[PDB]
Amino acid sequence: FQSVHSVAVIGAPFSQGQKRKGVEHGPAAIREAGLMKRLSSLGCHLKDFGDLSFTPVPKDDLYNNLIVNPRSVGLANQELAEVVSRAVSDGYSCVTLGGDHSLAIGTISGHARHCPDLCVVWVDAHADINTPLTTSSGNLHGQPVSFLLRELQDKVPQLPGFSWIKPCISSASIVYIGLRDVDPPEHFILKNYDIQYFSMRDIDRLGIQKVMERTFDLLIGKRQRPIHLSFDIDAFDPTLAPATGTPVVGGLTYREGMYIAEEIHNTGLLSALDLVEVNPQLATSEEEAKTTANLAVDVIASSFGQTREGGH
Amino acid sequence: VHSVAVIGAPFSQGQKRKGVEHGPAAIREAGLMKRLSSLGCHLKDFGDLSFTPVDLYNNLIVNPRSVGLANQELAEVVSRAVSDGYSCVTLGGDHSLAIGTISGHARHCPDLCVVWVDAHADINTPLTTSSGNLHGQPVSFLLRELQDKVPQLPGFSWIKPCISSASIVYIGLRDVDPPEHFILKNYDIQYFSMRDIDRLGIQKVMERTFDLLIGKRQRPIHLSFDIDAFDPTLAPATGTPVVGGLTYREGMYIAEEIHNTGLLSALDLVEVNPQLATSEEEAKTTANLAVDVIASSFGQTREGGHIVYDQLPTPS
Amino acid sequence: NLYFQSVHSVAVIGAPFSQGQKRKGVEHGPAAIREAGLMKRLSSLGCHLKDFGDLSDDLYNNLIVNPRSVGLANQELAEVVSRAVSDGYSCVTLGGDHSLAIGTISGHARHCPDLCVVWVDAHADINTPLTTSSGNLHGQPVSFLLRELQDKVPQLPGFSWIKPCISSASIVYIGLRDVDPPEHFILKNYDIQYFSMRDIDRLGIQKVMERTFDLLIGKRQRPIHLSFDIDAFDPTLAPATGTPVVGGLTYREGMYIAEEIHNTGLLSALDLVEVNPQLATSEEEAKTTANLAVDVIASSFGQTREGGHIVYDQLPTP
Ligand code: PRO
Ligand code: PRO
Ligand code: PRO
Ligand SMILES: [Mn+2]
Ligand SMILES: [Mn+2]
Ligand SMILES: [Mn+2]
Ligand SMILES: [Mn+2]
Ligand SMILES: [Mn+2]
Ligand SMILES: [Mn+2]
Numbered sequence: 001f002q003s004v005h006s007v008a009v010i011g012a013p014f015s016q017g018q019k020r021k022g023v024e025h026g027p028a029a030i031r032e033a034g035l036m037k038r039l040s041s042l043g044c045h046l047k048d049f050g051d052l053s054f055t056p057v058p059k060d061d062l063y064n065n066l067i068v069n070p071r072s073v074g075l076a077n078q079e080l081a082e083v084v085s086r087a088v089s090d091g092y093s094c095v096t097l098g099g100d101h102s103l104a105i106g107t108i109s110g111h112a113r114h115c116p117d118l119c120v121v122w123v124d125a126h127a128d129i130n131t132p133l134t135t136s137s138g139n140l141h142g143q144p145v146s147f148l149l150r151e152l153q154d155k156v157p158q159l160p161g162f163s164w165i166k167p168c169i170s171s172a173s174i175v176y177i178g179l180r181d182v183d184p185p186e187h188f189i190l191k192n193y194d195i196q197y198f199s200m201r202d203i204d205r206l207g208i209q210k211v212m213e214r215t216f217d218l219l220i221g222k223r224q225r226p227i228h229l230s231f232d233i234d235a236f237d238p239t240l241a242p243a244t245g246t247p248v249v250g251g252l253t254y255r256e257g258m259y260i261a262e263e264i265h266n267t268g269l270l271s272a273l274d275l276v277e278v279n280p281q282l283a284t285s286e287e288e289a290k291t292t293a294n295l296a297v298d299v300i301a302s303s304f305g306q307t308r309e310g311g312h
Numbered sequence: 313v314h315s316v317a318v319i320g321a322p323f324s325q326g327q328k329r330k331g332v333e334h335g336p337a338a339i340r341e342a343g344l345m346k347r348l349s350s351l352g353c354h355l356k357d358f359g360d361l362s363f364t365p366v367d368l369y370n371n372l373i374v375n376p377r378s379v380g381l382a383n384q385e386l387a388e389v390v391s392r393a394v395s396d397g398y399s400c401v402t403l404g405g406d407h408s409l410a411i412g413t414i415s416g417h418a419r420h421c422p423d424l425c426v427v428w429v430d431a432h433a434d435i436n437t438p439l440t441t442s443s444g445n446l447h448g449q450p451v452s453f454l455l456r457e458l459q460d461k462v463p464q465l466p467g468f469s470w471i472k473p474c475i476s477s478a479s480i481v482y483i484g485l486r487d488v489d490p491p492e493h494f495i496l497k498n499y500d501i502q503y504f505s506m507r508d509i510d511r512l513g514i515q516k517v518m519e520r521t522f523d524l525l526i527g528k529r530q531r532p533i534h535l536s537f538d539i540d541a542f543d544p545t546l547a548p549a550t551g552t553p554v555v556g557g558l559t560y561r562e563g564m565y566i567a568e569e570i571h572n573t574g575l576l577s578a579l580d581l582v583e584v585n586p587q588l589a590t591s592e593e594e595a596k597t598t599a600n601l602a603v604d605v606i607a608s609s610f611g612q613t614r615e616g617g618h619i620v621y622d623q624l625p626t627p628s
Numbered sequence: 629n630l631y632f633q634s635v636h637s638v639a640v641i642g643a644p645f646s647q648g649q650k651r652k653g654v655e656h657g658p659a660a661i662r663e664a665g666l667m668k669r670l671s672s673l674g675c676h677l678k679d680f681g682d683l684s685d686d687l688y689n690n691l692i693v694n695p696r697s698v699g700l701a702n703q704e705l706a707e708v709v710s711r712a713v714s715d716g717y718s719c720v721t722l723g724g725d726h727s728l729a730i731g732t733i734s735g736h737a738r739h740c741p742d743l744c745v746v747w748v749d750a751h752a753d754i755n756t757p758l759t760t761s762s763g764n765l766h767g768q769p770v771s772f773l774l775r776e777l778q779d780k781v782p783q784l785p786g787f788s789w790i791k792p793c794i795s796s797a798s799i800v801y802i803g804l805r806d807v808d809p810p811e812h813f814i815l816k817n818y819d820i821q822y823f824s825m826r827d828i829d830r831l832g833i834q835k836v837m838e839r840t841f842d843l844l845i846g847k848r849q850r851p852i853h854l855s856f857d858i859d860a861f862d863p864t865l866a867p868a869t870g871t872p873v874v875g876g877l878t879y880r881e882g883m884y885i886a887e888e889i890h891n892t893g894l895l896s897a898l899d900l901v902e903v904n905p906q907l908a909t910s911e912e913e914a915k916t917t918a919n920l921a922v923d924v925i926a927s928s929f930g931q932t933r934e935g936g937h938i939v940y941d942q943l944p945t946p
Contacts, residue, residue, distance in 0.1 A: 132627075155627070182616030201565065248606075
């Protein structure tokens with residue numbers, strides 16, 4: 001094979017960062033679409049940690065009539081952070097299957113425990129950077145980055161179950177790609193703190209090649225750094241990825257998404273990847289659910305060396 | 313903070329396919345007013361105009377009287393909306409309604425320029441049309457340099473040609489009749505076909521469009537936007553669909569660039585025909601797309617940048 | 629219409645090969661494309677037309693299926709194409725599976741030894757009889773044609789008539805996205821130039837066509853052979869085909885390729901292959917694929933998005 005990678009796979013069947021049921025079946029859907037076989041065929045040394053079972057929290061209602069399930073979200077992420085830490089500690093590139101995007105709190109925190117100069121490429125229709133004070137929905141899947149960013153620490157209140165989190169990335173160390181549904185406060189956060197982002201509009205103008213070039217220039221232009229790719233399937237157009245809870249029209253094409261993944265592979269710096277927000281229960285047909293899972297597998301496989309030219 | 317007037321113009325007699333008169337209602341139902349309200353627009357809804365009801369012309373041109381007259385009535389409403397300080401959004405209805413909207417707009421803004429976003433040039437004369445459908449001719453009646461090639465139709469004498477060939481640019485062209493192509497080339501009318509977009513990219517297409525129309529000075533902009541500019545996969549509920557059109561992204565980009573000028577004075581969103589859809593979702597997606605065009609033309613962004621946001625809350 | 633920007637002489641041959649692969653139905657490609665109104669469309673573009681109509685075995689090494697039927701059918705097809713081209717026609721062949729390019733290219737080369745090939749396809753179809761995993765000859769045609777690969781290619785039954793006729797420098801691929809590892813090796817090792825979908829994502833279709841022509845006709849005008857597999861298009865656009873691969877050309881990119889081919893004035897033969905109406909799930913899927921096939925062929929002979937191919941004389945006056 002062109003290159004061998006050691007890859008751990010963690011299922012995180014978690015739904016409480018949002019209100020729509022079924023995203024907890026994300027990890028199963030992706031698995032049934034053949035993830036392990038595909039990574040095997042590419043030369044990957046694989047370790048399957050299986051699908052985690054998160055400790056429920058009995059009482060966990062609306063916090064200040066706004067934040068939904070903070071204790072469950074906080075604890076599930078604390079648990080996931082331990083496993084991701086273990087995997088990275090053991091030397092694996094850590095693939096976590098979601099589950100809603102609240103789980104990036106745990107995956108990035110866990111990763112950061114071993115990589116002080118970690119950087120993040122966040123591929124998403126959404127910035128997910130509302131603080132608990134700026135959120136309109138109160139859904140923590142739209143807040144994960146606020147708890148991780150050092151610059152926002154003074155703006156984030158201490159939520160129950162969240163005391164264990166330490167901000168671990170600076171505003172210069174995360175680049176967003178694919179944005180198209182951004183709240184006014186999130187826009188203010190991005191601009192005010194100099195967080196670099198390439199919205200769908202930036203991609204329309206520059207094209208995905210220049211987007212990736214600039215992305216790497218910003219993050220790894222001066223030195224090599226481990227990369228955490230946090231990939232929300234809703235980055236893709238809903239015609240390609242319909243089985244997801246917060247679809248937004250005018251997303252990435254299949255080609256652009258593969259291009260992102262291929263460029264991440266080509267760095268040789270991919271250290272962890274999240275594939276989140278696949279909700280097969282939201283598909284209007286079996287083939288809608290299966291196409292979304294198949295697309296998830298293509299993203300992950302391309303991140304680990306699958307190409308459009310038979311070079312693997 | 314835009315003041316926006318919405319006029320329902322249920323034109324159907326510019327073409328032969330029934331249903332297009334329900335376009336203005338389909339768009340309303342898709343939640344147009346809620347969207348423009350969330351954008352901080354000052355809104356006036358004129359409701360749907362009831363035109364006064366009314367023989368073929370040279371055995372070809374159909375219902376021309378009804379079309380000519382309804383356009384005269386439309387043009388007065390647009391004139392007075394513009395006058396009352398509103399940006400004028402006219403919901404269609406077939407594209408023959410542009411005769412009335414551009415005419416009425418050119419009364420108070422003589423220096424207007426036109427961005428025509430369409431699969432079609434709609435510049436056949438009453439003598440070059442094969443179909444006889446007036447939705448395929450509106451630009452011939454409006455264009456100054458073309459007057460001696462256009463005969464006087466019953467109901468159309470009121471129309472004073474108000475735009476020169478250098479003040480209209482087309483974007484999206486892919487189904488242009490031979491006489492149309494002749495007109496485009498011989499009158500030096502600038503256009504960016506699908507093929508020009510494939511070469512240049514929509515960013516460059518918009519830069520060059522504005523260079524041509526407002527390169528010398530700021531001017532009021534009239535955006536005449538036919539939903540069939542978009543690929544039929546995206547906008548299937550429409551009468552003359554043509555494969556290989558704009559993507560969702562390209563169309564939002566045009567609207568956004570139009571907004572970013574701060575010059576948009578009037579906008580037509582034409583040719584949504586809910587009855588031509590093969591299902592209720594196809595009908596609804598077409599109307600949702602129409603809303604997205606209008607909202608982006610007035611400030612909706614892909615970046616959350618529509619409102620001013622000054623200060624983060626503190627747990628302080 | 630009396631007046632056109634250009635007038636082409638075009639021969640049409642139906643070549644319903646199905647034996648270069650295993651799925652039934654592709655032999656109905658030529659009928660599907662004719663029923664989508666191909667002849668009418670070409671007439672409307674001012675072409676002089678000659679319609680040649682539609683033309684009408686043990687495993688090799690326990691793998692390669694139908695070598696004699698395929699090798700021999702291609703010998704016959706080669707004759708028809710050579711005749712058409714010799715008589716001054718740009719020769720359009722409707723497939724049928726892609727194994728037919730063995731015949732069309734070999735025949736074309738008899739009269740046009742200096743031809744170049746633009747191969748538009750999800751696949752490189754450059755497996756040898758020794759590297760192929762499927763045994764399907766439609767995945768092997770380029771290996772028979774290429775000079776530099778002759779010593780890597782064994783003599784098959786039905787194939788003694790074929791002389792390799794193109795050098796590795798005279799073929800450029802566009803659209804590649806499903807390349808077997810031994811195919812990747814050949815491409816790199818013989819320095820065959822290709823624009824994969826990834827290359828199109830980076831350069832854009834305009835620069836891909838510019839660079840393609842710089843590679844092939846940059847030094848001198850040469851007859852162009854366009855071998856165009858419908859599966860180069862995204863399966864959402866061309867679902868009716870045997871080996872569909874996600875992430876393909878858009879409608880606009882495909883038409884752009886054909887328009888630029890037309891603009892060279894050098895198009896000398898064109899294959900339009902792999903349309904299999906039976907693999908559609910609906911009549912609209914089948915007809916869309918056939919209509920797209922017609923749009924490709926039409927656009928190769930002057931159909932454009934802007935409507936300048938028919939020449940208009942003067943506007944009537946009232
Ligand atoms: O915070 C939220 O819940 C939404 C999710 C997408 C953008 N903001
Ligand atoms: O003139 C007509 O009626 C048609 C409409 C689109 C192109 N020409
Ligand atoms: O040789 C074959 O049969 C396959 C078909 C596409 C790629 N190679
Ligand atoms: Mn997200
Ligand atoms: Mn998202
Ligand atoms: Mn129109
Ligand atoms: Mn139109
Ligand atoms: Mn092929
Ligand atoms: Mn192919």
